[PDB]
Amino acid sequence: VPVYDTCTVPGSFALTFDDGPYGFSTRLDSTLNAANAKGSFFINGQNWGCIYDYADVLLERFNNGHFIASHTWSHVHMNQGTYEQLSHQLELVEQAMIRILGVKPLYMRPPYGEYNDVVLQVLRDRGYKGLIMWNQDSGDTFTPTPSSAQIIDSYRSFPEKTISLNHEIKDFTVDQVIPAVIPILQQKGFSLQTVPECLGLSSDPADWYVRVQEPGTRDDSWTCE
Ligand SMILES: O=C(NO)c1cccc2ccccc12
Numbered sequence: 001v002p003v004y005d006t007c008t009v010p011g012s013f014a015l016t017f018d019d020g021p022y023g024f025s026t027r028l029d030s031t032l033n034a035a036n037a038k039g040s041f042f043i044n045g046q047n048w049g050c051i052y053d054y055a056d057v058l059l060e061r062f063n064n065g066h067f068i069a070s071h072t073w074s075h076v077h078m079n080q081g082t083y084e085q086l087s088h089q090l091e092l093v094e095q096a097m098i099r100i101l102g103v104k105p106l107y108m109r110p111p112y113g114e115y116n117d118v119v120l121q122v123l124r125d126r127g128y129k130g131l132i133m134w135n136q137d138s139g140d141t142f143t144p145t146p147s148s149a150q151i152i153d154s155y156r157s158f159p160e161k162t163i164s165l166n167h168e169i170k171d172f173t174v175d176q177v178i179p180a181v182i183p184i185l186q187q188k189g190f191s192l193q194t195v196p197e198c199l200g201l202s203s204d205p206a207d208w209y210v211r212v213q214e215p216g217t218r219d220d221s222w223t224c225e
C-alpha cells in the first residue's frame with residue numbers, strides 16, 4: 001500500500017481534517033461549500049462522539065464531493081496493536097460507512113501518524129489503496145497552542161501541493177482559521193482539492209470508495225455502545 005504525504009497536481013492544495021465529525025462540522029462544511037473548496041476528512045468511529053450521531057453531516061459531506069476516509073474506530077496507537085485488533089479497528093469504521101453511506105473507504109490516515117509493516121499489511125489485506133500522511137501541520141493541536149493569527153500566518157507560506165493537517169475538533173480551526181485561509185489560498189492561485197484528486201488519482205468521488213449496498217435506515221444497530 002502506498003504512503004502519500006504530498007500532492008502532485010500543479011497548483012493543488014489539500015485542506016485535511018482529522019478526528020471528526022464534531023459539533024462544528026456543519027459550519028465547517030458550509031464554509032468550504034460556499035467557496036467550492038473540497039476537504040479531506042479522516043473520521044473516527046468512537047472518539048469525540050459516535051459516528052452514528054453524525055450520520056446527517058456525513059451524508060452531506062459524502063454527497064458534496066468531500067473526501068471521507070478512516071482514522072480508525074477508537075483512535076488507537078496502531079503500532080501497539082496485533083494484526084487482528086487493527087483489522088477490527090478498521091472494520092468498525094467500514095461497517096459504519098456501509099450502514100450510513102452504502103460504501104467502504106479505500107484510504108486511511110493513522111492516528112498520531114504512527115504506522116509500521118503490520119498496519120501496511122492489514123491495509124493491503126483489507127483492500128485499501130493508500131495511507132495518507134501530510135507535509136504541513138497547522139499546529140492547531142500543539143500544546144501550548146498557537147493563536148489563530150499565528151496559524152493563519154503559517155498558511156500564508158505553505159507552498160503549492162501541501163497536504164495540511166488540521167483537526168475539526170478545534171473550534172478556532174473551524175471558526176477562525178479556515179474562513180481566513182480559504183481566500184488566502186484561492187486568491188494566490190491554489191485549487192482546494194481532496195487528497196485523491198491532488199494526487200492525480202481520480203477526481204470522481206465515486207472512485208474514492210467501494211460501493212457495497214444501498215445506504216441503510218437508522219435502526220438500533222446505529223450505535224457505538
Ligand atoms: O492523530 C493525529 N491527528 O489526527 C496526530 C497526528 C500527529 C501527531 C499527533 C500527536 C498527538 C495526538 C495526535 C496526533
Ligand SMILES: [Zn+2]
Binds near residue numbers: 018019071075111112
Ligand atoms: Zn487524530
